[PDB]
Each structure stands twice: as C-alpha cells, then as structure tokens.
Ligand binder design. Structure first.
Ligand SMILES: [Cl-]
Ligand SMILES: [Cl-]
Length: 691
C-alpha cells in the first residue's frame, strides 16, 4: 500500500454507496482524498484495517472492545459528537435508579424486582448485568445468563427475553397479551422511558437506565428528589451526582485505526475537512451526517454533528472506562477468574526495582497481593483505570491527576510527628499532618540564597511531584508570571521532562547511560534520594526534596558509597526570606507543607483493599510481626520503593475520601493554575473522558 488517501471500510452496499459519494465530493472541493472498501460486517472491517487493507471505520462500544483485542489492536482516534454545538454530548452514563426511601445498596439487589430497557442493550442489560456478575451464581457461557439473572431478581421486566424459558424476566412487563415483554414500543416498559416508568409505577425496585432519562422525563426538579442512584462503592446519592455515581460511562461511537502507523493524522485531517464542507447544514450537495430514505446511520450516525479528536494516551480500555470495560469482561469470564480477581489486590509497581520488592511482598502475602508494572507513574494509573491493576501509593501531585481521572484515595502514608519521635501504637488513627518541602544546598557557596537561585542548576525528584516540582515551580511562577519553566534554571535534572530539554541535561540515566531522565528508579537521579544525589555529586546547585531526605542520606544513614561520608553540617536550607539555615531547622525554613502520599484505587476496590492492607501491615509494617525477620513493607534501605521509607503506618482518612478533600482547596487551587502552563498526556486524556 502506502498511498496518500484515507481508505474507509463500509459494512454494507448502502454504506459503500455513500462512501463513493464522499470520495466524489472531496475530490470536487479539493479536500483530502478518501477511498472505499466494502465488507459484510464490522468485524470484517476490523480485520481489514488490522491487515492494512483499510485505514478507518466507525464502531460502537461493543466493537471498540473487540477491535482493541489481539490480533487487531485498533484504537479510537476520533469520537462522534451528538446533541448541539454548545450542547455537545460525547457520552452518557449507565446508572441504577431506585426510589427515595430505601436503604438497599448495589450489593444488596438479590431478591428485588428490576426494570431493564431491553435484552442485550448497553445501559439496560450489558452494563448492569456485567457489574452484578460476581453476585449472580452463574456457571458460565455454557449456561445462559438469563437463567441466573432470573434466579437473582424475584421478578423483572426485560423486553425481548424468552418468556418461554425465563418467564420471571417478563413478569413486570406491561404489554398486553402477546405484546407482553415485546422488544418494541408495543410494550410500555421498553427502552429508557419504559424501564423508568416501570420504576415510577412501583412495578420494580430499580431501573437500569441512563442519566439523562430522569431529567428528561421529569418535568419538575422536585419530582426527581424522590429518586436516587446506586453507586459502585455501595452508597446512594442524588440523581445529579451521576458523574460520580454510575455503573458505566458509555462513550460515543468512535473512528478506530491501528495503533502502529494508523495514519491518524490523515484520518483526522479528512474528518475535520469533511465536517467543515459537508458537515451539518454545510452543503446541499452532500451530507456526511445523514442517510437516504429507508437507510439509517451510514458510516456515521445521522445524529452526529461533528467529531472530537481522541487524545493519544487513550486506548480502547481507557475509552470505554473501567465500568463498561470490566462489565463486558465479566460476561465472558468464568466464575473462577471473577472471584479470584475480585479478592486479589493487584499492586502497580513503577520500574524494575519496585517490581522486585512487590514480587517479594506477593510471595509472602498468602495469595492476596499480586503485581503489575509500568515504566511511569502515569502508566500505572492508566492500568488501574483499566482494571488491570488496583492500587499504588502516590505523591499528592499524582493524587490530583488520579482524582481527575475518577480515582479515590484509600489510606495515607503516616510519617512521624517530628523527625524526632517515639513509636505510636495508634498510628493507624493518627491524623496525617503532611511534611515539609525544602530547598537544600551545599554549604560552600555562601552567596547562594532563595533570591539568587534562578538561573542556577537544579535537582528535582520528578515532574509533577509536590516538593520536587509543584511547590518550587509554583513559587517561581508567582514571582515571574512566566510559564517558561525550562528557563527558570540553566540546567536541571527533572525526570519526566523532555530528554532534549535543559530540564533533562543533568540527569545521568543508569550505569550504562540508558534511561536518562526517565521518571523511575532506573534514573539514578530520580526521586528524593536521586535528587539529593544530584546535589551531593555536585551536578546541581539546589535540590528540591523534603527535610527528612537529607537526614536519611547523611551521617552514614545511607550505605551507598556516594553517601557514606556525607555530613549533615555540609548542607543548608534556603528559606524564603533569603536566609540560610541548618537542615535541622526545616520547621522554620521550608518552602511549603505537602500532603502525605496516599494509596489510591477504584471505588469498587476500596473496601477490599483496605482490608488486605491493614492485614498486610499488621504483618509486615513497622510494628510488624514478620518485620524485620521476614519482610518489611516500609523498608528498602533509602530507596523509597512502593512506599516512603519513613512511613510509620498506613492511616485512615477521617472522611477525606475525595482528592479535593484530601489535598485541600489551597493545594488544588495551586496545581490547577500550574496546569494552565502545561499538562500531561493522562491529565488531558481524563479531562477529555469527563468533558
Ligand atoms: Cl440502553
Ligand atoms: Cl517530591
């Protein structure tokens, strides 16, 4: 192959015909060319694109899933946009609606009565029943789900269900005579309005519908407070909290392409152009969105009004979201895979050394903890979003991002009250107090102060971390108002930065010079320890770390040759008033306070993760029965792997159960403004998915 044209795949003769029109008109107006191939089915178009016989095709959620699998590995590159300009819909939410009053939760549905939009529909069946799979007592695909579902609810309306085999599923349906349980408007409990009316009517205890149906069928904003949602965390909430309380986010159909040499640029150019010429109400000569009489949704849905470009970080799993993703997954898995995956905790390790420690923990954990790994923190967060991993300990900076992505904090790393402090048997309930971010210098140059730090050489733990980045660059940002972070300092090591930039100039990679500036421990200047090393080995002039870092690495507290001979007295802190103080005085000479690192997860895993963690820490923590004679969760000899080495225990949050509450408005205000200057791939991905 290797042409200039985008080759589109059609799944029908009618579609093929519209494609040829398209091609005709693009050549007419001198826009990017589009060519056409035809197949008999969506999966045939997915094969063709994988095999380079085509480039693009529009798919729904179910086919986006299949397309992401091997041996296809396609990804969404552009989404359909619905609604109107200034009211565009890029998705909706599968929510569970019950009446105001009850106290039963998502986990206590067994025996109740249910209203569904219809058999094998997304919101009404695929998502709810995939979510409830673990409770469902279902052998596996060998036997039909309907049988188990019928054995779970006492009665349901599920339009289209086989009233012969599964009469229970049809009991509450309102159709007359043989139209009872019909997959059609002749059954009043059909589709979104139907199943909701089925709830309103007292027929059912729960309706599995989409968020918009409530405000659309409900005329007054007082009718709606008689209804709430069931959340995956097993709470209830009002109907307008769907953004935070939903079974699934159902995304718009998307154009998919291959992840390797997808021609994504050509495809987007095409769609952008086509949309501007033949988009909605742009030309009587040809209509991108619109089908001839008798036809519907050829190539694109007739209700589309344009396209949104999918951020590059986003693959099929991320596009669909953990709720949707895992529900589809659950419907294909055995009861064994599903019970096992449910009970196990998948930690995400960042880099090879963390994975090694994790795998050690795993081995001792009595099956309750397993490992996955990625090469960056953001890559781990995406694994958790996809349900391929469950948990990890994050810097406050990453807690923010994880939070925008819909993750929640679970427990916090508790540090000792002061550097000088006795053991506290009630650590687990001792409220976190944060730690001090400091700027550390060598003592030699007495002329260096906070006021002369700009234009010098800097050592940072990593981009987007709190003490290493957000705090110092935030401070600098106030004073100068510039978003030119790569110009604050002449040269830096700031892992996670562009390897070309000045920001990576001082980083040294691993022993072979590989992995320069990668934000994991392969980079020897990474993290608290690495940033301090960058200063001690004289690469940088200032290190942005925490106050305990210098302690942990001087006066023989670190074994490594570079650190063994370092004395406390050879380092100073830069105070914001231009003074210099000894490191023992950080309390009165720090940049700012920083929030404790926290363990984050998905809502669905929170309770299980708590239980496993408190157990594991009872065994391997500082008061550990198996620590140190077997294994210590909170030790890595000045390496801070998985957790910070100065963690006393993992402690409860005392209601501070969202990232906003845990970090505080102040902190969140500050990062928010920071992010104006620039953002990360995952941050952009997650704002897209919540747009
Ligand atoms: Cl639906
Ligand atoms: Cl940091």
């Amino acid at each position: 192959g290797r042409r200039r044209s985008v080759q589109w795949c059609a799944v029908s003769q009618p579609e093929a015909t519209k494609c040829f029109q398209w091609q005709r008109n693009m050549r007419k107006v001198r826009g990017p060319p589009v060519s056409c191939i035809k197949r008999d089915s969506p999966i045939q178009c997915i094969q063709a694109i994988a095999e380079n016989r085509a480039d693009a095709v529009t798919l729904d959620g179910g086919f986006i899933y299949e397309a992401g699998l091997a041996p296809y590995k396609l990804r969404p590159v552009a989404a359909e946009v619905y609604g109107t300009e200034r009211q565009p819909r890029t998705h909706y939410y599968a929510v569970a609606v019950v009446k105001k009053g009850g106290s039963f939760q998502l986990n206590e549905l067994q025996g109740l009565k249910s209203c569904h939009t219809g058999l094998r529909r997304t919101a009404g069946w695929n998502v709810p029943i995939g979510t409830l799979r673990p409770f469902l007592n279902w052998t596996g695909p060998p036997e039909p789900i309907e049988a188990a579902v019928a054995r779970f609810f006492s009665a349901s309306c599920v339009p289209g269900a086989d009233k012969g085999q599964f009469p229970n599923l049809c009991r509450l349906c309102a159709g007359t005579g043989e139209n009872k349980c019909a997959f059609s408007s002749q059954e009043p409990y059909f589709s979104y309005s139907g199943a909701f009316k089925c709830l309103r009517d007292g027929a059912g205890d729960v309706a599995f519908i989409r968020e918009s149906t409530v405000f659309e069928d409900l005329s007054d904003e007082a009718e709606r407070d008689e209804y709430e949602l069931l959340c995956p965390d097993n709470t209830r909430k009002p109907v307008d909290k769907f953004k935070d309380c939903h079974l699934a986010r159902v995304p718009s159909h998307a154009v998919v392409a291959r992840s390797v040499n997808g021609k994504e640029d050509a495809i987007w150019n095409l769609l952008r152009q086509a949309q501007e010429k033949f988009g909605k109400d742009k030309s009587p000569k040809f209509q991108l969105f619109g089908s001839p009489s008798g036809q519907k949704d050829l190539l694109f849905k007739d209700s589309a009004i344009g396209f949104s470009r999918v951020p590059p970080r986003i693959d099929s799993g991320l596009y669909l979201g953990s709720g949707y993703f895992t529900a589809i997954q659950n419907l294909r898995k055995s009861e064994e895979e599903v019970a096992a995956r449910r009970a196990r905790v998948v930690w995400c390790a960042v880099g090879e050394q963390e994975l090694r420690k994790c795998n050690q923990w795993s081995g001792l954990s009595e099956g309750s903890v397993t490992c996955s790994s990625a090469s960056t923190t953001e890559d781990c967060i995406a694994l958790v979003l996809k349900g391929e991993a469950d948990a990890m300990s994050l810097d406050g900076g990453y807690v923010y991002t994880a939070g925008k992505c819909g993750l929640v904090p679970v427990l916090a790393e508790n540090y000792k009250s002061q550097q000088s402090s006795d053991p506290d048997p009630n650590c687990v309930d001792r409220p976190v107090e944060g730690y001090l971010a400091v700027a550390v210098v060598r003592r030699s140059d007495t002329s260096l102060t906070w006021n002369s730090v700009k234009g010098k050489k800097s050592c940072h733990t990593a981009v987007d971390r709190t003490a290493g980045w957000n705090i110092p660059m935030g401070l600098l940002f106030n004073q100068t108002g510039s978003c030119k972070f790569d110009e604050y300092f002449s040269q830096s090591c700031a892992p996670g930065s562009d390897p070309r930039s000045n920001l990576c100039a001082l980083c040294i990679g691993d022993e072979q010079g590989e992995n320069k500036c990668v934000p994991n421990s392969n980079e020897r200047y990474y993290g608290y320890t690495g940033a301090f090393r960058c200063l001690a080995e004289n690469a940088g002039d200032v290190a942005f770390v925490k106050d305990v870092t210098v302690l942990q690495n001087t006066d023989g507290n670190n074994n490594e040759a570079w650190a063994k001979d370092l004395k406390l007295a050879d380092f100073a802190l830069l105070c914001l008033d231009g003074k210099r103080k000894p490191v023992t005085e950080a309390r009165s000479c720090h940049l700012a306070m920083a929030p404790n690192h926290a363990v984050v997860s998905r809502m669905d895993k929170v309770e299980r993760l708590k239980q496993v963690l408190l157990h594991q820490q009872a065994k391997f923590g500082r008061n550990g029965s198996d620590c140190p004679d077997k294994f210590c969760l909170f030790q890595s000899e000045t390496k801070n792997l998985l957790f910070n080495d100065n963690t006393e225990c993992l402690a409860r949050l005392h209601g501070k159960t969202t990232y906003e509450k845990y970090l505080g408005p102040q902190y969140v205000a500050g990062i928010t403004n920071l992010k104006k200057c620039s953002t990360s791939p995952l941050l952009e991905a997650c704002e897209f998915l919540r747009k």
